[PDB]
Design a protein that fits this description.
The structure is cut from a larger assembly and holds chains A, B and C. Chain A is of the alpha/beta class. Chain A contains seven helices and eight strands. Chain A has helices at residues 6-12, 43-61, 77-87, 104-123, 131-147, 170-179, 207-228; strands at 16-19, 31-35, 38-41, 67-70, 91-92, 160-164, 183-187, 198-201. The longest helix of chain A has 22 residues, at 207-228. Chain A is globular and about 65 Å long. Chain C has helices at residues 31-34, 38-50, 70-86, 91-97; strands spanning 2-7, 12-19, 24-26, 29-30, 57-64. In chain C, strands 1-2-5-3-4 form a five-stranded mixed β-sheet. In chain C, 29% of the residues are buried. Classes of the chains: A alpha/beta, B alpha+beta, C alpha+beta. The structure holds one RNA strand.
Chain lengths: 233, 205, 124
RNA sequence: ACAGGUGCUGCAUGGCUGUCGUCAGCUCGUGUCGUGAGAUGUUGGGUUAAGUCCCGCAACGAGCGCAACCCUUGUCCUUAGUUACCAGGGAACUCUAAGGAUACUGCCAGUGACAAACUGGAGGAAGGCGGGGACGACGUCAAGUCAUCAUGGCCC
C-alpha cells in the first residue's frame, strides 16, 4: 500500500479545486483546466506526488521516526484524530497554538501540567477537593487537553509534518521553515505551494477526499512499522 | 510610602510575637522599656555573629531570651565561656538572673535579616550594588525558596540623585495573609550616605 | 410553653408562648404600660394578628438591651420564633410577611478621618 | 581627645507618610513580526466590582495587582456556668468566649455561542461581593518629614 491509484481519487472528488478567482498563479503548472469557472487539478501530478509522499513516510516508519499530523479545518477536524491514533503519531486538530514548535521549550510546562492532572486523576485525588473545586480542576484538564491532545506524547520536535489545506495552516508552515523540519502538505488550487518539500496537489475541502489522503498516509506509516518489527529476531 | 509592614499585618493569622509576657498596665511599660533595652544592647554587643530572631519571653521573675543565630560557635565560645559572661551582663540591667538559650539556623539563607545583613555588609565594603543585590537573589533561590524580593534605596553607586532598584524572583505575594513572608529592613552606612536594604523571603503559604 | 429567642440591633428578647386568653406581659409589666410607643405596640402585636389569632395565646416576654423600638423588633422576632414551634404551617405566612428574618442592620462604626460612619469633614 | 547643637541642606539620604486610588491596571520570560524605536501577549465577541471569567486569537506562560486567606457583625451547634442568667436551688434560656456548621449560582425556570454569564423562583438567619473593616500594584507629585529617629556633607 504505497501506490495510491488514480481511480479512487476521482471517485472521492480530489480534482475539484476552487473558483478561477482565488487561485494562486504559482499553482499553475499542474492544473488540467477550468470548467464551469472551477479549476480542475491534474491527477497525473497528484498521484505521482503521493507515490513520492507515501515512499517518504514509509522510510520514516522503518526508522522509528515521528511525523506530526496537522489539520484544524472542519473537513479535517476529526479525521486527523482517529487516523493518528491508528498510527500512534501526534496530531493537532483543534487549533495550532502559535509557537507549538519554535516555542516548544515553553509548551513543555503546559504538557507537563496536563500529565500531572492525569496522574492525580488516575489514583483519585478528588476526595480532598470540594464539589466545585474538583470541577474547576477537571474543567482545566479538558481545556488543556483539547488544545494539546496529540502532542502530549511527542517528546521533542518531529522530523516531518503532514498539513492539510496549507492555506489554512500557514502558521505551521512558517514555523516548519524556521526550524527546517520537512513538511508534507496538501495544497488546494488557491494556496501557496512554497516552503512545502513534498507537495500534494489535492482538494482539501471535501470530507471524502480529506479522509482518503489522511488514511492513505495512515496505512503507509503503519506499513513501515510492521516492516520495522521484522528485525527483532 | 504605602506598604504596611508584612510582619505586623500577619501577627495573628500566621505569625507569632517575639515577646510572650503578661504585665499589669502599671508594670507593662517598665517591662517593655526594659525589653527594648535588651534588644538594642544585644544587637550591638553581638553584631559579629549573624543573629536574626530574638524572642524574649519572661516567666514570673526570670526571662528566657531565645536568640536564633547562624553561628552558635562564636556566640557560645569554648565550653560556653562567652555565653556566661553575657549571662552576668544581661541580668545586671534586668531583674533576677535570666537564662539565655541559642537556637540553630539550619539554612542561613531563607532568613530576611541574615540576607539583608549580608547585602548591608557588602555595600559597606565598596561593592557594586548590582552584584550584591543579584547574588543574594541567586543564593536564596538556590537555597530553597518560592520567592525573593530585594530592594535597595539610596545613593546607589555613590550618585547624587538617589533611586530605588529592586530585583524580584519568584512569587512573594504580599497581599496574601497566609504567606509566611520573612521581611527585614536594614541599612548600609556608606561614605556617601545611608543605603536602605529591604528583603522579602516568601517560603510557602 | 413554646420558647422563642428574638433579636434586633442590640436588644435580645425571650418570649414564652402559651395557650390562653391573649394577655401580654413584658418584663413583668403589661405591654401597654411598658411601651408608650404606639408603633412599638403594633410591632409587638403584629404577628399575632397577622394569622388571625390575637387573643389565643398568653405571652411572657423578658427583653434586655437595645432601645424602645429595637426591643419591639426583638419581641416580634421572638414571637415568630415561638409561633413556629406549635405549628409549621404558619411559617410560610410569617416568612411572606417577612418576620422570620433577623435584621442584621447595626450601627455602622465611626471611621477615622470621618465625622460619623460616613459623614465627611467638608472641604473647600 | 571630645561631648553637646530642635543649627543648615527632605533638592545629598534611610526609615515612615500623603496622593492619584482599592482606580484596574502594571510588567516580564520564551516565541514571532519589524532595519529600528517598538509591537504581540495585554487586542477582538461577550461578561464582570475587577487584565473577573469564558470563547476567539502568533502567541505560549508567569509575576505584582483583583478575588480569597484575616478581624467584626448577622443564624445555629458543641465545651463551660462564676462575680453571669432565673423557665421550672436549677444547668433550661439570655449572656459571656473559645472551637465549629452554613452560602456553594448548590437546586428550579428561562435567556445566552450547546459558553462565561445574566434574570427571576424555592429553601434558609443570611443569595449571588449578605453589611462593615484591615490589606493600597508598577509608578506620580525632586509631595511631607534633617523637629520622633538615624544619616552624607556644611556650620558653632
Amino acid at each position: 500500500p504505497t501506490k495510491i491509484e488514480m481511480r479512487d481519487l476521482l471517485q472521492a472528488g480530489a480534482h475539484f479545486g476552487h473558483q478561477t478567482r482565488f487561485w494562486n498563479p504559482k499553482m499553475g503548472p499542474y492544473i488540467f483546466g477550468a470548467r464551469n469557472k472551477i479549476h480542475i487539478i491534474n491527477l497525473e501530478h497528484t498521484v505521482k506526488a503521493f507515490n513520492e509522499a507515501l515512499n517518504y513516510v514509509n522510510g520514516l516508519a522503518s526508522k522509528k521516526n515521528k511525523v506530526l499530523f496537522v489539520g484544524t479545518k472542519r473537513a479535517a477536524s476529526g479525521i486527523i484524530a482517529e487516523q493518528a491514533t491508528r498510527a500512534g503519531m501526534p496530531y493537532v486538530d483543534h487549533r495550532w497554538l502559535g509557537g507549538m514548535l519554535t516555542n516548544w521549550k515553553t509548551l513543555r510546562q503546559s504538557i507537563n501540567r496536563l500529565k500531572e492532572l492525569e496522574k492525580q486523576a488516575e489514583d483519585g485525588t478528588f476526595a480532598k477537593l470540594t464539589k466545585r473545586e474538583a470541577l474547576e480542576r477537571t474543567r482545566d484538564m479538558q481545556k488543556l487537553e483539547r488544545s494539546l491532545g496529540g502532542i502530549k506524547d511527542m517528546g521533542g520536535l518531529p522530523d516531518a509534518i503532514f498539513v492539510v489545506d496549507v492555506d489554512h495552516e500557514a502558521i505551521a508552515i512558517k514555523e516548519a521553515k524556521n526550524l527546517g523540519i520537512p513538511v508534507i502538505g496538501i495544497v488546494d488550487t488557491n494556496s501557496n505551494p512554497d516552503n512545502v518539500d513534498y507537495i500534494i496537489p489535492a482538494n482539501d475541502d471535501a470530507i471524502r477526499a480529506v479522509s482518503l489522503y489522511v488514511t492513505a498516509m495512515a496505512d503507509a506509516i503503519i506499513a513501515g512499522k510492521e516492516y520495522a518489527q521484522t528485525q527483532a529476531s | 510610602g504605602q506598604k504596611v509592614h508584612p510582619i505586623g499585618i500577619r501577627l495573628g493569622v500566621v505569625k507569632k510575637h517575639n515577646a510572650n509576657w503578661y504585665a499589669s498596665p502599671k508594670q507593662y511599660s517598665e517591662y517593655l522599656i526594659n525589653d527594648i533595652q535588651v534588644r538594642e544592647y544585644l544587637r550591638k554587643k553581638l553584631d559579629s555573629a549573624m543573629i536574626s530572631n530574638i524572642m524574649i519571653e519572661r516567666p514570673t521573675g526570670a526571662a528566657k531570651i531565645t536568640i536564633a543565630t547562624a553561628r552558635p560557635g562564636i556566640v557560645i565560645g569554648k565550653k560556653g565561656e562567652d555565653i556566661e559572661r553575657l549571662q552576668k551582663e544581661l541580668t545586671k540591667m534586668m531583674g533576677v538572673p535570666a537564662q539565655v538559650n541559642i537556637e540553630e539556623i539550619t539554612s542561613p539563607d531563607l532568613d530576611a535579616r541574615l540576607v539583608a545583613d549580608g547585602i548591608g555588609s557588602q555595600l559597606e565594603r565598596r561593592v557594586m550594588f548590582r552584584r550584591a543585590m543579584k547574588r543574594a537573589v541567586q543564593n536564596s533561590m538556590r537555597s530553597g525558596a518560592k520567592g525573593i524580593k530585594v530592594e535597595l534605596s539610596g545613593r546607589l553607586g555613590g550618585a547624587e540623585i538617589a533611586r530605588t532598584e529592586w530585583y524580584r524572583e519568584g512569587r512573594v505575594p504580599l497581599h496574601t495573609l497566609r504567606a509566611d513572608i520573612d521581611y527585614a529592613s536594614v541599612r548600609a552606612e556608606t561614605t556617601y550616605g545611608t543605603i536602605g536594604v529591604k528583603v522579602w523571603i516568601f517560603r510557602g503559604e | 410553653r413554646n420558647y422563642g429567642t428574638g433579636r434586633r440591633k442590640t436588644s435580645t428578647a425571650r418570649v414564652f408562648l402559651a395557650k390562653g386568653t391573649g394577655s401580654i406581659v413584658v418584663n413583668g409589666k403589661p405591654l401597654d404600660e411598658y411601651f408608650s410607643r404606639e408603633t412599638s405596640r403594633m410591632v409587638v402585636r403584629q404577628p399575632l394578628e397577622l394569622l388571625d389569632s390575637p387573643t389565643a395565646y398568653d405571652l411572657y416576654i423578658t427583653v434586655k438591651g437595645g432601645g424602645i423600638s429595637g426591643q419591639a423588633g426583638a419581641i416580634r422576632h421572638g414571637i415568630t420564633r415561638a409561633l413556629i414551634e406549635l405549628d409549621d404551617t404558619n411559617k410560610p405566612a410569617l416568612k411572606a410577611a417577612g418576620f422570620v428574618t433577623r435584621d442584621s442592620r447595626q450601627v455602622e462604626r465611626k471611621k477615622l478621618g470621618l465625622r460619623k460612619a460616613r459623614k465627611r469633614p467638608q472641604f473647600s
